[PDB]
RNA sequence: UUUUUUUGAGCACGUGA
């Protein structure tokens, strides 16, 4: 609907240079921010970009969303309305069964509320599961609602106490 | 004693963030950002005076200017 | 503790070198 759009999975060394030109492409841009630590500097590895008009906007979505930047899947999605609602909507999730899979997620975590970014650490050595995972839920009380909802349960399928705190950090 | 290594320079050049400053006693025109300067940003503008260490950045190998502050 | 880093002091001249 708006014209924010939120950029994730940004390499380190990209610069506020190099994320403007990229998405100069699509349109005009009004301001365009990657986010970083006042005092070192370092990227939080994700920015800000709001361009002119809203059919650029929703351009850059549909061809940047997923393309490879230095070995990181860029990820261009819109920006939500941020403030104290989207705090604390992050969610450690661990104990879930090594057969979990993506689906079995939307299903585990679907009704509690709509979900931002999941995902589901594996041993890549091996390439299956670590029974341990990520959901960031929009809004904090989606969240809190499924910590209560899931924490200390058996999922729909395995036999083991899931695990279900905010992430730390 | 002695071990802080500061010297004086003219601002030349202001962003939001960060700046850019004509040193005196050095030939140089360094960068440095808006952590780096002490107290009241909202009124410094081109041509003041600042004293400052020139240092080159830990992330990024880069000639800049640390520990800024003015003398105005 | 993730593609370390999804809601905000442009950390390189404000902008497709």
């Known amino acids: ?10 390499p380190q060394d990209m610069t506020d240079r190099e994320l403007y030109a990229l998405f100069r492409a699509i349109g005009p841009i009004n301001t365009c921010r990657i986010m970083r630590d006042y005092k070192t500097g ?15 906007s929703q351009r850059a979505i549909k061809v940047l969303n997923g393309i490879t930047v230095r070995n990181k899947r860029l990820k261009v999605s819109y920006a939500r309305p941020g403030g104290e609602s989207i705090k604390d ?11 979990i899979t993506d689906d079995q997620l939307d299903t585990i975590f679907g009704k509690y509320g709509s979900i931002v970014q999941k995902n589901i650490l594996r041993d890549k050595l091996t390439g299956r599961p670590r029974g341990v995972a990520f959901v960031r839920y929009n809004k904090r009380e989606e969240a809190q609602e499924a910590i209560s909802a899931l924490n200390n349960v058996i999922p729909e399928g395995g036999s083991q106490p899931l695990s279900v705190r905010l992430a730390e950090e | 004693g002695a071990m ?23 030939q140089a025109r360094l960068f440095f950002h808006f952590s780096q300067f002490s107290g009241n940003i909202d009124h410094l503008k081109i041509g003041d005076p600042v004293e400052f260490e ?11 200017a640390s520990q800024v502050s003015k003398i105005a």
């Open chain 1, 1 to 10: 609907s708006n014209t924010n759009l939120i950029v994730n999975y940004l």
């Open chain 2, 4 to 26: 802080a290594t500061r010297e004086t320079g003219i601002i030349e050049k202001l962003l939001h963030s960060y700046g850019f400053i004509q040193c005196c006693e050095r």
């Open chain 1, 89 to 99: 909507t992050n969610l450690y999730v661990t104990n879930l069964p090594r057969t």
């Open chain 2, 54 to 64: 020139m240092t080159y950045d830990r992330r990024t190998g880069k000639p800049i």
């Open chain 1, 42 to 56: 370092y990227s939080f590895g994700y920015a800000f970009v709001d361009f002119t008009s809203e059919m650029d």
